[PDB]
């Protein structure tokens, strides 16, 4: 039951998200047979890196570094929203909730989950990008001109402390699900059936952590505190974006992201 639910969540988590934490840590610890990721630390290494990905993927693109990076960020975020949506629909009970509530949960859940999964791709020195084939240094990101130089920093700060807890993909699968099924999102119509799903997810999470992190009794408690922390990180990310939105006349926000940000905080 609870062990069965943890297994089901792990399997769809693996199906919904290509680059897993296990895979990410192997790349970052050189514990991989693959070619090391190309490192990006300045103007010229960014250009070199882009040369290489011109042979892997593919209308408008700025010649200003910070805006171009932020545009690349937007498209990755859009692709994360899709993945997170397919994941949520795999959570037993979710798709049977009122549609307006489903939309609300994703609207408020999506960024919290993004910063959670981003942690997996980070260490204190930088972040993996493009499916793990590149690595952008933290310091290079801190150097970007305002207001973009401070865009990734709080996300690194979160991840450094979060990664200290050593969750693996199976823990993360349930943790994410608990976050999505929060009955205290603003504007929910039917709180009860959401809490009823979260209750069982919470139980599965507690059990999973007791079994796999036996040395850290009270890891459950510490995880629960992170879920709330994330709420304020998003809140402050959203304030940063309204600044960018108003003062950066060049770039245009992506429509899906506008949808999520609108009337949010």
């Amino acid at each position: 039951d609870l062990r069965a639910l943890a297994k089901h969540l792990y399997d769809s988590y693996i199906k919904s998200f290509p680059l897993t934490k296990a895979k990410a840590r192997a790349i970052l610890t050189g514990k991989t047979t693959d070619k090391s990721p190309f490192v990006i630390y300045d103007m010229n290494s960014l250009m070199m890196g882009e040369d290489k990905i011109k042979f892997k993927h593919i209308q408008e693109q700025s010649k200003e570094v910070a805006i171009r990076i932020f545009q690349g960020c937007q498209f990755r975020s859009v692709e994360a929203v899709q993945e997170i949506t397919e994941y949520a629909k795999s959570i037993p009970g979710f798709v049977n909730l009122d549609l307006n509530d489903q939309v609300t949960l994703l609207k408020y859940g999506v960024h919290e989950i993004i910063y959670t999964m981003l942690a997996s791709l980070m260490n204190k020195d930088g972040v993996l990008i493009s499916e793990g084939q590149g690595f952008m240094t933290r310091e290079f990101l801190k150097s970007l001109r305002k207001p973009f130089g401070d865009f990734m920093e709080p996300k690194f700060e979160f991840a450094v402390k979060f990664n200290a807890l050593e969750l693996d993909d199976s823990d993360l699968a349930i943790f994410i699900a608990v976050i999505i099924l929060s009955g205290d999102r603003p504007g929910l119509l039917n709180v009860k059936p959401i809490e009823d799903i979260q209750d069982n997810l919470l139980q599965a999470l507690e059990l999973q952590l007791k079994l796999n992190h036996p040395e850290s009794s009270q890891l459950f408690a510490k995880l629960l505190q992170k879920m709330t922390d994330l709420r304020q990180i998003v809140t402050e990310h959203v304030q940063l974006l309204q600044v960018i939105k108003k003062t950066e006349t060049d770039m245009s926000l992506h429509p899906l992201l506008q949808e999520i940000y609108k009337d949010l905080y």
Binding site: V81, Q82, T85, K89, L99, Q102, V103, L106, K107, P255, L256, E259, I260
Partner: peptide
């Protein structure tokens, strides 16, 4: 939330 609704 047009796009979100469609995703859902």
């Amino acid at each position: 939330h047009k796009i979100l609704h469609r995703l859902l």
